[PDB]
């Protein structure tokens, strides 16, 4: 990992933000060399990302480099599409929508340059309609370029070019899975399918699709434009790259910054800009993932670098790329229930473990917080959480327990004493 | 809230402005043919827009356009959130309350 | 005609013996010497059922709202 950073220069993977929002020639960075890329054999791009080997921003492992050079090697009778989440499911994510808001010109390229690797046919994106204003403008961004003849059907210089069809959702979590999105792109109700039909690259719209994420297809052109040998810059021999973090919930100026891997949380939280709560003596009870990781106390987290597998060393890792912390007044038990009260409303409801199994917790979590009937429950409530893992289809269950699974870990007494606080009270 | 209708506007009636039948040419043009069969997500919502909340005769209408048995619509309008089945106001306001927002 | 219990003769009327197989089934009708009849065992077709054929390009089997 080198020098234990993760610095930020003007040399980064994102071109500009406050400079130019509208269309043009991509005055400096973008749309630079194209006809040379596409005219060379497609699999040249395939595995040429391996110089980086992006883990992927979809909240998981499984480097993006494999799945595209993965099946969808051949082609037979039926077209292939691209479905790239723009959605945000996790509370406090916020990383998305900043990419789109002030610089859309990147991703329409990101597909066209990207889609050629798939050998795909069309391009769908998807956006939660809950963003009405910013999402409305992409069409202009599509038009303001696409109208110039930059895309389709040969554009430019190849015999292969195809346009991008925006769509919208409503009350979606649906980006909560692939093999759901490709279902509610269709117009059924969205109940995500079983994971191994034929996994997500066989059963699809009518025909094989691949579900990418935003900065997985956003940073691909610039990492195939230059690459290197700088493609692997920070992070150890395992995880490599520089992703975006967006700090939220206590800071001086919670705001995004581009930061490379293996950055410790004690300098990163304090920096960009201040630590404005107590940098210490505010107890710094932290959540690595947005909703997908339980607490860490004042322990090795602060020295624990943000590298992925570095977090699997602790009791939980995070792929979500977000930060929420706390200081003093926020009662964690009080502040984790409204993370659970959230889950109960976003779940499909097919499976018997998820449905009727999350409420069993959510109905009891309003006992502990309020303070109420006796311990030895905690010992059970742990087993429930241990009882939903292989039992649910999607990850929302595997992402349902961890907050409670990792609350019972790391804080014993805060509960034990409160059940007394109402016990002595009853007396 | 309850998800059954007490026969409010079975015939409201309702219809789309003839300015809107020229866009639905464009929506269906997105998709491939023969699978079209659901554009329902924009098309059902565009109807909310023309009105401002969609009564039960709105749910029955698009079926005559999209030829799907209209329990393959009443379903989709009771899953998502953004659609408002009951009437509403001129401003429908939200307060984000969640762990960070808390 | 006092209560409505349905009283009866036909003193067998309730016996079910249980044999293990046909070859040894008829074994006990002859050996005790009364008439009889036979039915046949039934088991299903093989059969062929595959999930994941339910989402199809040109096939006519394509389910919605499952």
């Amino acid at each position: 990992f080198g020098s234990l950073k993760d610095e930020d220069r003007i040399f980064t993977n994102l071109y500009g933000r406050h400079d130019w929002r509208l269309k043009g020639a991509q005055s400096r960075g973008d749309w630079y060399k194209t006809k040379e890329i596409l005219l060379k054999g497609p699999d040249w791009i395939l595995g040429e990302v391996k110089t980086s080997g992006l883990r992927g921003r979809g909240g998981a492992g499984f480097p993006t480099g494999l799945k595209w050079s993965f099946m969808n090697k051949p082609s037979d009778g039926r077209p292939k599409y691209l479905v790239v989440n723009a959605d945000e499911g996790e509370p406090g994510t916020c990383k998305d929508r900043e990419i789109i808001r002030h610089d859309p010109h990147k991703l329409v390229e990101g597909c066209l340059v990207g889609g050629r690797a798939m050998g795909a046919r069309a391009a769908y994106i998807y956006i939660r309609g809950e963003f009405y204003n910013e999402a409305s403008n992409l069409q202009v961004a599509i038009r303001e370029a696409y109208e110039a003849g930059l895309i389709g059907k040969n554009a430019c210089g190849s015999g292969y070019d195809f346009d991008v069809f925006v769509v919208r959702g409503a009350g979606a979590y649906i980006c909560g899975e692939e093999t759901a999105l490709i279902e509610s792109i269709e117009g059924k109700q969205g109940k995500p399918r079983l994971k191994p039909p034929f996994p997500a690259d066989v059963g699809v719209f009518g025909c094989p699709t691949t579900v990418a994420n935003v900065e997985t297809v956003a940073v691909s052109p610039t990492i195939c434009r230059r690459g290197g040998a700088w493609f692997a810059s920070f992070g150890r021999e395992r995880n490599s790259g520089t992703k975006l973090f967006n700090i939220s919930g206590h800071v001086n100026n919670p705001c995004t910054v581009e930061e490379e891997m293996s950055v410790p949380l004690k300098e990163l939280i304090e920096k960009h800009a201040g630590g404005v709560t107590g940098g210490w003596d505010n107890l710094l009870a932290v959540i690595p993932g947005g909703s997908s990781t339980p607490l860490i106390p004042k322990s090795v987290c602060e020295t624990v670098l943000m590298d992925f597998d570095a977090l699997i060393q602790a009791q939980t890792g995070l792929g979500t790329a977000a930060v929420i912390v706390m200081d003093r007044s926020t009662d964690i038990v009080k502040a984790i229930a409204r993370l659970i009260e959230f889950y109960k409303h976003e779940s499909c409801g097919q499976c018997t473990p998820c449905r009727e199994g999350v409420d069993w917790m959510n109905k009891v979590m309003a006992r502990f917080v309020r303070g109420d009937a006796r311990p030895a429950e905690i010992d059970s409530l742990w087993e429930i959480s241990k009882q939903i893992e292989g039992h649910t289809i999607c990850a929302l269950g595997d992402g349902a327990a961890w907050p409670v699974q990792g609350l019972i870990r790391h804080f014993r007494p805060e509960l034990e004493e409160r059940m007394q606080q109402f016990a002595q009270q009853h007396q | 809230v309850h998800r059954d209708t007490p026969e409010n506007n079975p015939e409201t009636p309702f219809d789309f402005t003839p300015e809107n039948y020229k866009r639905i040419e464009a929506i269906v043009k997105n998709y491939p043919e023969g699978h079209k069969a659901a554009a329902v997500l924009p098309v059902l919502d565009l109807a909310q827009r023309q009105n401002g909340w969609l009564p039960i005769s709105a749910m029955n209408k698009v079926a005559e356009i999209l030829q799907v048995p209209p329990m393959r619509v009443y379903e989709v309008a009771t899953f998502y959130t953004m659609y408002n089945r009951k009437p509403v106001g001129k401003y429908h306001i939200q307060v984000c309350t969640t762990t960070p927002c808390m | 005609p006092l209560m409505g219990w349905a009283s009866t003769a036909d003193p067998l009327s309730n016996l079910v013996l249980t044999f293990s197989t046909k070859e040894d089934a008829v074994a006990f009708a002859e050996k005790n010497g009364w008439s009889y009849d036979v039915e046949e065992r039934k088991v299903p077709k093989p059969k062929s059922k595959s999930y994941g054929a339910n989402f199809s390009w040109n096939k006519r089997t394509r389910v919605s709202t499952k």
Partner: peptide
């Protein structure tokens, strides 16, 4: 900013410039 009026967004440049589609069939 334009509350209604997705029209030309959907039907102006998109309508003419979304070729072909071939999209096949799927009769079914």
């Amino acid at each position: 900013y334009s509350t209604y009026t997705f029209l030309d967004l959907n039907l102006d440049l998109s309508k003419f410039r979304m070729p072909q589609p071939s999209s096949g069939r799927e009769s079914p």
